[PDB]
Design a protein around this nucleic acid. Structure first.
Lengths: 97, 26, 67, 225
RNA sequence: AGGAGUGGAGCCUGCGGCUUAAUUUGACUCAACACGGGAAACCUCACCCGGCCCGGACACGGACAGGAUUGACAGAUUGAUAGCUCUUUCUCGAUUCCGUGGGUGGUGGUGCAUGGCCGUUCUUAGUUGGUGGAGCGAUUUGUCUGGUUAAUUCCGAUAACGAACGAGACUCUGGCAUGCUAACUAGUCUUAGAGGGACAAGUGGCGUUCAGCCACCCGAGAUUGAGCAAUAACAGGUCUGUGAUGCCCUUAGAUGUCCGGGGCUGCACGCGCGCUACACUGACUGGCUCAGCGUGUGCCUACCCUACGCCGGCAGGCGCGGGUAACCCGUUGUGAUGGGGAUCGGGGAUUGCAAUUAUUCCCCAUGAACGAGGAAUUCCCAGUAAGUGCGGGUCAUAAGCUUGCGUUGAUUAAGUCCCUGCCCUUUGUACACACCGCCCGU
């Protein structure tokens, strides 16, 4: 934990713009393979991801030292209830159908 | 019937031996 | 030991009873005809079968053999 | 930029292995069997085999698009360089992976091991399979765990031919009581062409061409009307 | 009645005896004891003279612009440019905290709850249906009198007939072309081929003259390395490899971190792997072209292998290029004397904080039972053993370990069941937890 809240809203913007992602456990390092150069410290961002997926309502799947996530519609409802951003802003992921 | 067969042949002489044999056909 | 297992024995016996006409005595000819008429999936086994059929013809040339 | 060829081949093998494990833990319930990559100029086409395909694609390929997105964002390929297809397998009733998954998903919900296990042994046998051996090891309830095995037909163990004649699948089925290990071994039947059996026969089987019946008169005499 | 090397004479580590910070998990003889690919500073240490930022989807309690987060040498700390000083009322700023457990867990228990991969009695040749015989039955035949074989390999006999595993066959591996498919790095020698070649084949001698055994020309090669390897097995090992695993269950000194910090590098040894050749053979004149099997630089990542000059006598303190590799490294006088080293000191040290509480060259010849070794003994039959070095795994070119590789290279036996143990039989039994049994006697 030991997580700030501006990093929280930054990571919530990241989840809103991203949705489906793959993660790798990296905490002590100063340079990540594929999730650096975000102008934000990496450790707090990854702990923010840990909070998201271990708050007790979104399930995980860990193997081959990696995290693949199944973002449930319960998470969509939770984000809408808390941040009050209408789902009418459709995610950009629905192109190249 | 199959479950009784499995229980019997798992431990054909243990604690669950007489009951399973009786339950088979009686 | 050089004991020929049931596979080579049975193959040589069936080979000699089915195509006795073509088969002879000289190992080169037995090997050639054995390759030609028998689908043997090895080369070492093919040579073993040809050697045993050569032995069996040495047996038959001097009397009948019960096999 | 460039790595040594030994490292290149090892990394390609690691790619294949981790992709196989990843879509094994993804869609085992989809009757996944195997994954094959195809070498194409500056591209890497991937074709995926499953017993069922309507489920693996689903409706408008939500599952397919999710899988391609995750594989792309995991492996680091250039944007849209990885694409996975889904084609049925001609050998479903005697493929070790498919039958191991069938056994696990018949045993998961709660069922006598013997009924479903003999049923899959049957469905193996009517699929032309030459021989099968299934072992189920684990808690048969009580302070001791045991292993029960059912074999049918002919199936070999030793020598080279076990490499290209017998396929064995080892899986874990998680029961609320414990973990039951299922080992399913199938020997394919020999059939040249069609890729349904090993090309080579068993190396101790000598094949002979069969002559046809011959009952002939003494001398061939020409007959004309 | 053979032997060689043996554990003793030239390169330290496993775990128990074993004062406190030193004897630190799992493994109770063959099937533990450089084994956990576990080469101990430190991240991996739980024997450790010491601490901290702490862990809660919830069941109950303390209640909001302050209820503190690695974050100053000089008064000190218990090695430490750590704010831990009973100190400053600097500093991300609502993060957090306490007492109970499930929880994003734990390399914390139980491998006498498991799976999977393993070790073994199993390196031996052994196992099993179906149908038919026999028996009331457990069960037995097939699965055998014999001969033969490495082999339940085969011949043959035959209430068994047909079959299935295991063995063989099979894959890899070396051995062979006055042959073949072709390379501006070798000139078809090196590399790697759709292929050939051996098969007990030819001839003798033993074998209901069968399966087969011996011998010899011929032949490169005439019981030619290994790999894979039958159900039932064992409470053998692994939960300390694994969001592989069912929850009984401790503690905040979480068995997370941070060039940091005692050990175990003790020597009256409690044990087990390890470091090592006796003379014209051992070693230098440097006076003729030598082989390695193999390794080598960005998803990580900051660590890869290496050729000329400052020159004391060379690796080399700094520049200097080549190599994603058949292209570069690289055609890599009769025996203690002169003869093989008992501690230990100088030359420029390879640059690894610390090496001494394990990294780092040979020359002065200062003289050590200086010429086959208590009981008990492990391994080995031909390119064996043994002597050597070299390359990987560990990694900083860290080895004394291990896994492979070549070079030098062979005295002894082509046997037996005496010791240990195994198997295709008969036999005895009061054993079946199966002889480490059972059991009798005040």
């Amino acid at each position: 934990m030991l997580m700030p809240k501006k990093n929280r809203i930054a990571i919530y913007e990241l989840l809103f713009k991203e949705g489906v992602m793959v993660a790798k456990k990296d905490v002590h390092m100063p340079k990540h393979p594929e999730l650096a150069d975000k102008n934000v410290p990496n450790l707090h961002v990854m702990k923010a991801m840990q909070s998201l997926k271990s708050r007790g309502y979104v399930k995980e799947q860990f193997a081959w030292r990696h995290f693949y996530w199944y973002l449930t519609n319960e998470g969509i409802q939770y984000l809408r209830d808390y941040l009050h951003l209408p789902p009418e802003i459709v995610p950009a992921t629905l192109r190249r159908s | 019937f199959s479950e009784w067969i499995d229980d019997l042949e798992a431990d054909p002489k243990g604690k669950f031996a007489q009951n399973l044999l009786k339950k088979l056909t009686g | 030991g050089r004991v020929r297992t049931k596979t080579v024995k049975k193959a040589a016996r069936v080979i000699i009873e089915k195509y006795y006409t073509r088969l002879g005595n000289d190992f080169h000819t037995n090997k050639r005809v054995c390759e030609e008429i028998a689908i043997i999936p090895s080369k070492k086994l093919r040579n073993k079968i040809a050697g045993y059929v050569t032995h069996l013809m040495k047996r038959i040339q001097r009397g009948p053999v019960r096999g | 930029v460039q790595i040594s060829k030994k490292r290149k081949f090892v990394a390609d093998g690691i790619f294949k292995a981790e992709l196989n494990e990843f879509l094994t833990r993804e869609l085992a319930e989809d009757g996944y069997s195997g994954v094959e990559v195809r070498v194409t100029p500056t591209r890497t086409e991937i074709i995926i085999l499953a017993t069922r395909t309507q489920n693996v694609l689903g409706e408008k390929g939500r599952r397919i698009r999710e899988l391609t997105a995750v594989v792309q964002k995991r492996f680091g390929f250039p944007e849209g360089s990885v694409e996975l297809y889904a084609e049925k397998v001609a050998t479903r009733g005697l493929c070790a992976i498919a039958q191991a998954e069938s056994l696990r998903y018949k045993l998961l919900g709660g069922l006598a091991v013997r009924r479903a296990c003999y049923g899959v042994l049957r469905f193996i046998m009517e699929s032309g399979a030459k021989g099968c051996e299934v072992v189920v090891s684990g808690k048969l309830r009580g302070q001791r765990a045991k292993s029960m095995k059912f074999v049918d037909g002919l199936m070999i163990h030793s020598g080279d031919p076990v490499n290209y004649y017998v396929d064995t699948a080892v899986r874990h089925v998680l029961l609320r009581q414990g973990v039951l290990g299922i080992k399913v071994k199938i020997m394919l039947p020999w059939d040249p062409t069609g890729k349904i059996g090993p090309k080579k026969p068993l190396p101790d089987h000598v094949s002979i061409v069969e002559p046809k019946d011959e009952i002939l008169p003494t001398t061939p005499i020409s007959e004309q009307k």
